[PDB]
């Protein structure tokens, strides 16, 4: 599927991911595009933080969904 990651700067990254993918895996894809390493990445969806160990399916993140990237927490 396809999802969007909105940075604090305003930039909007588009990621191709499958729902089986872990949040850790999503952060690796963000590293590919934006060069920020996963240790610094913090992904926020529905006002909560998303755990690296859980999948996109676990959180009910679907096609065209938008996640918020934050750095160093």
């Amino acid at each position: 599927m396809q999802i969007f990651v909105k940075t604090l700067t305003g930039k909007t990254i588009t990621l191709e991911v499958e729902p089986s993918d872990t949040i850790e895996n999503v952060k690796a894809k963000i590293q590919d595009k934006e060069g920020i390493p996963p240790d610094q990445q913090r992904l926020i969806f529905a006002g909560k933080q998303l755990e690296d160990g859980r999948t996109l399916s676990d959180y009910n993140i679907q096609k065209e969904s938008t996640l918020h990237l934050v750095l160093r927490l």
Binding site: S20, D21, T22, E24, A28, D52, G53
Partner: peptide, 27 residues
């Protein structure tokens, strides 16, 4: 709990069904 990839040796989460780094299918 984490599983080491057979190919690139990277330690992935139990929930994952593919390696985060090399994207090989989990055994």
């Amino acid at each position: 709990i984490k599983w080491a990839c057979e190919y690139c040796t990277y330690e992935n989460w139990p929930s994952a069904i593919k390696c985060t780094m090399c994207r090989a299918q989990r055994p």
